[PDB]
């Protein structure tokens, strides 16, 4: 497999066949597969040394692991994308043995003294070919020299089997399984052989080889493989149900933020709601998790202007729930990243000296921002893509609040719509779905650099298009939804969650 450790030092050798047995369209699919892989690797925050080699009759080395540029993901992606199938088409042999000898030269140290960290270093080789090596000698004998040189499998006391992993991708229309199965590494319950049909559905391919041993707790990281369920697609997604006599059953959403804490709206609960009447289910288990206490925001007040004439006041509609027992992160249980944290800095691939304001600028520009929230359809979680109206139409998004039932004759718009609210919904630039009342409390999700950051919490909507418990049939276009900005309540979260050790800047 492959271990993802932030303290790691790993060499990744990319060998790409360029013989006529491949074809241009399949060679491009080979490139698109590598580009997605390199991007997904950089999402974990690990910096390996990349080696890029294309070979036919003679190997051509593009990136050597000795260069400092080998640790640049974007630069290697640029080098790979520029490579063309007909770049060395006129030398269209298949001499894999020489290409492996070049890799052997890369890991080979000068003279007889290996640099320190040779056994500390992990080595990974990825080969793509048709299994029809026609030029040069046997390629397997170079593998034995690599096994010997790295002292792998040569000692019972220290096997070193986990320091080398070999994957082979069967590309091109015609392909030979026999030689490919011989080239690939063979380990118990580890996939190292891939066929032509495996080139589709890439997320499942990487799911088999990646081992998240030292990367379990990273925030905002999703498994998108086809077999995955709702919670593979939303690890932070938490379903919160409140059932209490007289009040009855009610359901809201929540987002995992730490081992003990889930973030959700405040208006879903009340001070009268007892902790035993609140049930939260993260991973989808039917075993409901017990809670300890609900931390309402100090400045929250639903009846702040009730005597003035306002029915409900949703300012600072956030709450932190502390679980009775701490969660154990996994493939279906992971937190969502929070703004102005070192984790968000590493998620956005920013230097450690990046400020909270610089992160604020990137997340919330004065424009329409692509985002999404979570909704339920027939007891199944589904994604709804929306736009945050932060540009010039931000005023028009706030103005549509006048059509909300119960606030039609309220004179002052700035009183009810506080700067905490982020405004979505509408038909411009594109149609944004409107939330059900059960969808309230969920996070407002933005996607950047193959990761997911939370920027808001679902608050309330102008028009309840999902009144009859169904969001069926068309609705007027001015139905807007409002969400609580995280930057406004950032001091309260930093104060409360500083004991969870999330690395606030």
């Amino acid at each position: 497999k492959i271990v993802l450790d932030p303290s790691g030092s790993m060499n990744i050798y990319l060998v790409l066949d360029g013989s006529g047995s491949i074809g241009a369209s399949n060679f491009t699919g080979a490139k698109k597969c590598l580009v997605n892989l390199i991007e997904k690797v950089a999402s974990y925050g690990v910096k390996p040394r990349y080696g890029l080699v294309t070979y036919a009759t003679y190997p051509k080395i593009w990136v050597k692991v000795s260069e400092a540029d080998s640790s640049n993901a974007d630069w290697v992606t640029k080098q790979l994308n520029e490579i063309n199938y007909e770049d060395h088409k006129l030398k269209s042999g298949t001499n894999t043995k020489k290409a492996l000898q070049a890799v052997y030269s890369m890991m080979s140290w000068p003279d007889d003294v290996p640099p320190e960290g040779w056994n500390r270093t992990r080595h990974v080789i990825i080969l793509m070919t048709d299994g029809l090596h026609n030029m040069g000698g046997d390629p397997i004998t170079v593998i034995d020299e690599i096994r010997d040189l790295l002292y792998i499998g040569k000692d019972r006391k220290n096997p070193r089997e986990d320091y080398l992993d070999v994957y082979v991708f069967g590309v091109g229309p015609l392909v030979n399984q026999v030689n490919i199965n011989a080239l690939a590494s063979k380990k118990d319950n580890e996939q190292h052989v891939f066929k032509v049909k495996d080139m589709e559905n890439l997320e499942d391919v990487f799911y088999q080889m990646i081992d998240e041993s030292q990367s379990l707790s990273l925030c905002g990281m999703v498994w998108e493989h086809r077999k995955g369920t709702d919670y593979h697609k939303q690890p932070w997604q938490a379903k919160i149900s409140v059932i209490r006599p007289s009040k009855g059953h009610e359901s809201c959403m929540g987002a995992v933020v730490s081992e003990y804490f889930v973030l959700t709206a405040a208006h879903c609960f009340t001070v009268d709601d007892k902790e035993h009447s609140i049930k939260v289910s993260v991973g989808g288990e039917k075993r409901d998790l017990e809670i300890e206490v609900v931390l309402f925001h100090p400045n929250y007040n639903i009846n702040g202007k009730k005597e003035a004439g306002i029915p409900e006041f949703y300012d600072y509609d956030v709450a932190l729930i502390k679980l009775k027992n701490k969660l154990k992160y996994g493939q279906t249980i992971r937190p969502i990243c929070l703004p102005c944290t070192e984790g968000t800095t590493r998620a956005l691939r920013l230097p450690p000296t990046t400020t909270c304001q610089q992160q604020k600028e990137e997340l919330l520009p004065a424009q329409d921002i692509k985002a999404l929230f979570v909704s339920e359809e027939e007891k199944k979680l589904t994604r709804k893509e929306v736009y945050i109206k932060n540009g010039d139409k931000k005023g028009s998004c706030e103005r549509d609040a006048q059509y909300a039932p119960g606030y039609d004759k309220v004179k002052d718009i700035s009183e009810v719509v506080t700067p905490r609210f982020l405004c979505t919904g509408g038909v411009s630039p594109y149609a944004d779905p409107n939330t059900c009342r059960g969808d309230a409390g969920g996070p407002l999700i933005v996607h950047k650099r193959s990761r997911f950051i939370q920027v808001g919490v679902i608050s309330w909507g102008v028009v309840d298009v999902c009144k009859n418990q169904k969001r069926q049939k068309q609705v007027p276009a001015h139905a807007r939804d409002f969400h609580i900005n995280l930057f406004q309540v950032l001091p309260w979260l930093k104060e409360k969650l500083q004991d969870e050790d999330l690395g606030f800047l």
Partner: protein, 84 residues
């Protein structure tokens, strides 16, 4: 036009069911790569049965392969959840 006859519609419904499982077959065969050798042995055996059943259009083999491929799919689903 005239509506389809007795068995033509029924045979199509069964085929659509088999086609659906076959679309995720390559994914499931891949998913067993990190699982125990029991699954890898079981699914590749159950895979061809469905593949031959579709191109042969044999009702007997298409029915069995459907439930045979459905069972190993459920075994993989439980295996991945308990493996975490």
């Amino acid at each position: 036009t005239s509506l389809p006859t007795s068995n033509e519609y029924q045979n199509e419904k069964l085929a659509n069911e088999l086609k659906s499982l076959l679309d995720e077959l390559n994914v499931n065969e891949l998913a067993t790569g990190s699982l125990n050798t029991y699954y890898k042995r079981t699914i590749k055996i159950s895979g061809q049965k469905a593949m031959y059943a579709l191109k042969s259009k044999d009702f007997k083999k298409m029915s069995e392969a459907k439930y045979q491929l459905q069972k190993i799919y459920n075994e993989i689903d439980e295996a991945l959840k308990s493996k975490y």
